Design a protein around this ligand. Structure first.
Ligand SMILES: [Cu+2]
Ligand SMILES: [Cu+2]
Length: 143
């Protein structure tokens, strides 16, 4: 925006991953039935509301670039450490899965306003190890 002579910072700190919580999920391709199984297990350390209070988290799960309706977990009210314990199934033949990307996005449910996103992350199908169940914690990223 300018020569950048004045500024200080701060800039390195602003680049770091924000503490927006983490989501544990699992993933397995069922070659018998030809479907992708996704386990939305639990989230931890979701951020407290600006001025105290807990959020009402739920997770949207879907595949890009597919235009189909997103799956959603139940809403867990007033908790920053929800255990979802839900499984979703995507009926997609393996051959068609390679170019897709799984997205998991945690939102804060509200009945009277747009639901604020808490954070999200993506899992490209082309870097998943289909020979073993995948299970990991992922830090939620801004957006
Ligand atoms: Cu093995
Ligand atoms: Cu093993």
């Amino acid at each position: 925006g300018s020569p950048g002579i004045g500024g200080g910072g701060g800039g390195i700190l602003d680049s770091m991953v924000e503490k927006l919580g983490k989501l544990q999920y699992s993933l397995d391709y069922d070659f018998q039935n030809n479907q992708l199984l996704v386990g939305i297990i639990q989230a931890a350390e979701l951020p407290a509301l600006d001025m105290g209070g807990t959020s009402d988290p739920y997770v949207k799960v879907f595949l890009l670039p597919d235009k189909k309706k997103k799956f959603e977990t139940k809403v867990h009210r007033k908790t920053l450490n929800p255990v979802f314990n839900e499984q979703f199934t995507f009926k997609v033949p393996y051959s068609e899965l390679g170019g897709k990307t799984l997205v998991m996005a945690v939102y804060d449910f509200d009945r009277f306003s747009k639901h604020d996103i808490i954070g999200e992350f993506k899992v490209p199908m082309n870097t998943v190890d289909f020979g073993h169940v995948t299970e990991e914690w992922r830090d939620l990223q801004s957006a």
